[PDB]
Amino acid sequence: HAKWVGESATAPEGVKPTAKATWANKTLVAEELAVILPIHENVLADATEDLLAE
Amino acid sequence: ADTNRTDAAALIQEAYSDVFLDSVSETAKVIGTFPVYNMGTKTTNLPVLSTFP
């Protein structure tokens, strides 16, 4: 931010102030979702629906 | 002394032949002889007349 500035050669009012910018960091970290669905071959053959599609 | 068969044995190779070598024969009969039904699922029901008047 700026400030209001005086005209003195000696008083604190006449000094142009000093100031900072600053940056920060955010992260994406990849993580894994999973499941395994086992089925028996004969059940998969004897059922009326395509259970591998289901 | 003489050079006998045991002395020459390192250079006396044996032969090999297949006259008695065979695969297993397929001896099975029941699918060839009896009526075959192609099943579409584990169980099939076969109704029969049991008694009559």
Which residues of chain B neighbour A49 with C-beta distances below 8 Å?
none
Q: Dihedral of CA A40/A45/A48/A54: which sign? A: positive
A45: closest chain B residue by CA: B41
Minimal-distance CA residue of chain A relative to B43: A46
Residue A46 exposed, middle or buried by CB count within 10 Å (0-12, 13-18, 19+): middle
Please say whether the beta carbons of A4 and A14 come within 8 A: no
CB A5 within 8 A of CB A12: no
Please list, in sequence order, all residues whose beta carbon lies within 8 angstroms of the beta carbon of residue A5, skipping any fewer than 6 positions away.
Answer: A13, A14, A15, A16
**Per-residue tokens: A22:** 């600053």
Measured in whole angstroms, the distance separating CA A41 from the mean position of its chain's CA atoms is: 44
3-class secondary structure per residue, B1-25: CCCCHHHHHHHCCCCCCCCCCCCCC
CB within 8 Å of chain B, chain A residues 12-31: none
B41 touches A at CB < 8 Å: yes
